Amino acid sequence: DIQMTQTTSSLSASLGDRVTISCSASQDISSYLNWYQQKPEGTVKLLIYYTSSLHSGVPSRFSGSGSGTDYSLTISNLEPEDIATYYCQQYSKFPWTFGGGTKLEIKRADAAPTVSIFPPSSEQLTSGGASVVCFLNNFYPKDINVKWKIDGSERQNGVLNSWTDQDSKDSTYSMSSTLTLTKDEYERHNSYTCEATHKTSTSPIVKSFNR
Amino acid sequence: PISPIETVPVKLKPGMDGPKVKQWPLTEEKIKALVEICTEMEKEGKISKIGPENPYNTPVFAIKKKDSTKWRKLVDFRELNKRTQDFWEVQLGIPHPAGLKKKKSVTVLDVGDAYFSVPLDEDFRKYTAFTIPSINNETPGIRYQYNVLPQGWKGSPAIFQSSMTKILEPFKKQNPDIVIYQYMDDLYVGSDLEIGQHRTKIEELRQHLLRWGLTTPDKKHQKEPPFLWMGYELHPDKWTVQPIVLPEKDSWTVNDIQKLVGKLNWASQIYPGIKVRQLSKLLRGTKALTEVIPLTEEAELELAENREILKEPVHGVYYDPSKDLIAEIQKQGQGQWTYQIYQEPFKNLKTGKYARMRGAHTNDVKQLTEAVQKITTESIVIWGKTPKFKLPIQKETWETWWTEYWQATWIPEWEFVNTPPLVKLWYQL
Amino acid sequence: QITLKESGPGIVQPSQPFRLTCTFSGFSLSTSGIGVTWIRQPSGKGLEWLATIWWDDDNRYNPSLKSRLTVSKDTSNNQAFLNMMTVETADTAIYYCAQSAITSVTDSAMDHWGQGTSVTVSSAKTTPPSVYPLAPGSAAQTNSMVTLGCLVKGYFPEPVTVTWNSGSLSSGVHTFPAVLQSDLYTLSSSVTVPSSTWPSETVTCNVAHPASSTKVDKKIVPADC
Amino acid sequence: PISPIETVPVKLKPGMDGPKVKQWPLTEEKIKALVEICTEMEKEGKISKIGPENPYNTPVFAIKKKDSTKWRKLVDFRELNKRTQDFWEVQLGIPHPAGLKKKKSVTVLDVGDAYFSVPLDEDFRKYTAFTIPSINNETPGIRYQYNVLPQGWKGSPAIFQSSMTKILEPFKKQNPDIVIYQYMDDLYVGSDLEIGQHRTKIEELRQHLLRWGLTTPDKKHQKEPPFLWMGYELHPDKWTVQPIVLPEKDSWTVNDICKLVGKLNWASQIYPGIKVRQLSKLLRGTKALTEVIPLTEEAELELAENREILKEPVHGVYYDPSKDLIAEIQKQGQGQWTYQIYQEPFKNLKTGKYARMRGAHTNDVKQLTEAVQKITTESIVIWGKTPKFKLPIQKETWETWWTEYWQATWIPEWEFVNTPPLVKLWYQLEKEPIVGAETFYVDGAANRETKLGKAGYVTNKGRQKVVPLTNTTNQKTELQAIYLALQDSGLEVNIVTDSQYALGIIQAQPDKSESELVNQIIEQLIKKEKVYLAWVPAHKGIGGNEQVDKLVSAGIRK
DNA sequence: CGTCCCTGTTCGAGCGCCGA
DNA sequence: TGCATCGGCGCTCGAACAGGGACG
Ligand SMILES: OC[C@H]1O[C@H](O)[C@H](O)[C@@H](O)[C@@H]1O
Ligand SMILES: [Mg+2]
Known about the structure:
Chain B: It comes from Human immunodeficiency virus type 1 group M subtype B (isolate BH10) (HIV-1). The complex is a heterotetramer of chains A (about 210), B (about 425), C (about 220) and D (about 550). Chain A folds into two domains: about 1-105, Immunoglobulins (Immunoglobulin-like, Sandwich), CATH 2.60.40; about 110-210, Immunoglobulin-like (Sandwich), CATH 2.60.40. Chain A is built from two helices and 17 strands. In chain A, strands 1, 3, 4, 5, 8, 9 and 10 form a seven-stranded mixed sheet that branches. With about 210 residues, chain A is mostly beta strands. In chain A, a hairpin with a 6-residue loop joins strand 16 and strand 17 (about 205-210). By secondary structure, chain C is an all-beta fold. Chain C has two domains: about 1-125, Immunoglobulins (Immunoglobulin-like, Sandwich); about 125-220, Immunoglobulins (Immunoglobulin-like). Helices cover about 30% and strands about 20% of the residues of chain D. Chain D has 13 helices and 23 strands. Chain D has helices at about 30-45, 80-85, 155-175, 195-210, 255-270, 275-280, 295-310, 365-380, 395-405, 475-485, 500-505, 515-525, 545-550, and strands spanning about 45-50, 60-65, 70-75, 105-110, 130, 140-145, 180-185, 185-190, 220, 225-230, 230-235, 240, 315, 325-330, 335-345, 345-355, 390, 415, 440, 450-455, 465-470, 495, 530-535. In chain D, the strands form seven sheets. In chain D, strands 16-15-14-17-18 form a five-stranded mixed sheet, with helices on one face. In chain D, strands 7-8-4-9 form a four-stranded antiparallel sheet, covered by helices on one side. In chain D, a hairpin with a 3-residue loop joins strand 11 and strand 12. The longest helix of chain D has 19 residues, at about 365-380. Chain D is elongated, with a radius of gyration of 33 Å. The relative contact order of chain D is 0.07. At the B-D interface, helix 1, helix 7, strand 9, helix 10 and helix 11 of B face helix 3, strand 7, helix 8, helix 9 and helix 11 of D. Magnesium ion binds near residues 443, 498 and 538 of chain D. Chain D binds a DNA duplex (20 and 24 nucleotides) through strand 2, strand 3, helix 3, helix 5 and helix 10.
């Protein structure tokens, strides 16, 4: 029940860089904290045991630093593997507890989302339903925001979203968003607008259609 | 009644009587535990109530073992042991394993219980009497004495030895590589197995003993840190000597040369050819202390040489098993403590430095008692004998707290000394 | 040479129990200090300690869950188990087991991990996906890049395999992670091919659902009106 | 009746036989007197007529109480006592009101005819044979022997005590929530029962004792606070030491002093701070008992201060287990130390004082330690728990002391209490040879066959000095040399000896001593600003040592 | 090397106080 | 014409003891 906190959760950097992640305790855990690495795949490995001891086979560029309430993991100089999610576990007292994890990412020039909106397939409509898909592709950074609007009127009922993980090769993101209405509620309007607000254009990128 | 076995007769060293040592105060906590352990030892008939007619006494106290959390009665039988030294040492002395010092791991099992199953020579019983004190002296003392071999009496392991050898025949023949040594209420078990396999063979011994009557304490293994239980095993290899070392100053003022002379002088009694003439010459006239005397090339020749004599253990030091063992401790400060064990003066058999348990709490008393236990353990392992301690403390100060930190089944002999830091014959920088 | 492998039912009726098995080699649950730990990681969330079974059955349970948890072992077979009574949807997560070991007076870490087991709590019944194409409408294609899509809606359980043109297309593809909708899964994939390619050259989306032993194709014909 | 407890076996010391001591003659009046007394005793089972074959005798005479005019039988057991085996005394300390707990209901009882109710070992009886002479030269006297515990015999206390313990034993197993303070033949009983339920238990007890020969006369305090027990008066919430009046006599013989100091000490237990270090020094010096001694005013001051306190009425309270123990030490006139043990601020439990001085040369840090050690043990004894201390020494002073002393030391949990005369180390030897001060190479010597010798320094600046001494010894002199160097020196100096004896005394940071020479050396030390001593193995030739050596061995060496 | 000599430590004696 | 005995405490004094040295 010693709550563990890693404040910085999402962090972008670059190969070569030296990074440091924070792990603070709710109470002096006397250096009984360990560091775990979890690749994007999900396999989980042990980096450091006991505040700063290097688990065997772990690259000599990892360092544990810390004491009392505050502890820091320090990746010497980034390699492409290192870009992963990091965890700190405390073992001073059971129940054992982990930080919230800090996802280490890859810095890339900014990029606007390539918006595209799609009418409700013919087949979907034949069955009695209507989903309006809108892709927000390869944009940077992650922080993006969507907004549906029907005949100008903004709608939030039926909107399901899905964000991807930083793409491995081009370091960007993507986002699907689907407004699900009934076949008639769809056929009871004309305007469907997808609005993407991204830290690139002070103006929302919009795309729409009329049944 | 416990064993149809005939009791072996024991007689105090001629001309000496039994112990008439008074019972010291006890904290409620210990009394309560002492009362409980005694009431039940009484039921099972191991001890017996007795009154003033028995003119002997030995003191009692109990220690709550960090080992197993369970209290342990402790009767300070040092007087009695001294008064019956022909019996357990000369006559029925238990041989020592040279090889025990050589194992990589050695565990200690408290096998006192084995004793409660052997009758104690009927006549000899009056000598094991003890008294239980009462908070605020609400009632007189409650006295008792033993019928079975008492724990902590050097006679027991001596007597119970035939039974012990028997009990171990099995386990020892199916492990011709493990070493077992009995020293009073303990069993020193040492192996060269990987620790995990060692830790296992121990449980296996614990089993064999059980399948034979002998119960041995359940040691705790907490899951929260510090995993203190990791120390249970002793490792007679990280056991190294601490030779004396001559400093290395950039420039040597008068002061330094002086000090380097006293020490190099002291050491001359231990080591053979420590010569100091050449080096004292540098301090030939009434000079001021702070004067940076430049080291002679004639002198330097030997400073950096004597030190070569100071890198090898006192040569010609034999361990006579027929003699006693004395140990001195010097409070080097910074939780530091050094110690020498010898039989004759200046012919040390071992020198070392007990570092400092992180649980020292800036309590010298606590650390000294811990150092005394450590050195005692080393002594038993290495020569199978307890040293007499020349303790760097004030008798009346040590007597007020040592039990609070004691965690052993035995108690070594000790005296008090007040010798200032003459020369750091034994220290560094 | 130390390995661990979680096994379980992957999908569990709510209120019902499940039993996970960790099979390991390379060490023994008999060697003092060793123990096996069960960790959990809800979909998208972080690591959660569940319980640790020690070489001396001096087990430890996470307070929040000690009530429905039971750890156990079969030392002779190098297996450790985790029982979980009355599971709820919130129990849907990946469960790892890890060799945990106390080595010194200070060192105690989870040295090696398993890949996990996905336990999903859902009363849902296996349903094959309904596939709908996605072709732009009013904004007819221009001499640039066009982006076609595919919608795999209301299936169960996971996963579904989405590829474009039977594996031919793989550069401008994005298959987004699924989501829950009425206890069913819904996801989409997007492909971005140069306009000179579509519709002049058919672009079909292939959706495979192992669970229902189904495979379906959807040709992305341009929206007529 | 006589108790039915099994008797405790008594032997004579190894190799010794019983007392065969002659009976002096007695007045016809004294004789018939004893004859009454003994017939009553014989009739009561206490004694029995013995046979001719019994060769022993211990004197018996009678004397009367001037107030009653009634005679009493006094038997002189000195020789039996000398021949009676040793016992292991079981009365281990006297109980104290301070350790008592407050109890709902309380009763105190006293047993009647204590000793005379416990059977004496059947086999040891013949030794207690005594004779009450015939009115004349006529017939052999009347021979008797004891069948119970004789008054004034070596074993009666230990044996009655054990006996009483066995008797209470069962009653206590069946009533584990009724405290019974068993002191010889006095029983303090208390419980948290309702006056009724309680009395129904106190009855039950007296009955049990009766069943055992122990009579509980109507000399029992029932619902009667003040409870007169062990010399105190016990009230429901406070207890008092029965009034203590000291002989305020005209002149003063040594013996009078003892009767005063002892009485005062008895008072030190409740009367806050009592100094006695003062008038106590009077006894000092080989004085014969009746010899009068001039009551020094230094001593007069004490008595004055003291009496003043004894005038003021005080009290103490009972112990409440939950609220831990607090012991606060006060520094008094040099040597002395007072303390109060309490749990709730101005409500003392007990007050005492520590005044012994271990060692010739010592110092207030030590004495404070020695004080804290005593208080600890005394607490363990009354409450079985160690107390929390409030000491007049700053954590800082302590930090330095214990950290630098070569002897190991400690103090249980405490805190500084600002309230002088605070304790502090007065001076401090330097750690390094100070530059900007000479280096007096001291030394000294003497001749065992003459009692005299020289002793002085030889600084680096070609300087000398060599005061001659008579009635000294190497130790005295080498300690003397170091004295000079401390006067003939600035507020910064380096001294250098060949003697551990001297060096040792100094390092201890002494701040008081038995010998002036050292009090004067301490004086010189608290007066400098940078003293620093180094040691050198005398007789080796080291630097300015040969110098002072020959200079002092002048007419003793070569 | 075997004595002696000089301290400083400890502990019991001999008084007193207090208890039963 | 004992006022004992046993226990705890205080105070002092004076054996007995245990190093460091010093003479022979
Ligand atoms: O065996 C050496 C080390 O092995 C592993 O790295 C463990 O995590 C560590 O606790 C142990 O001390
Ligand atoms: Mg000299």
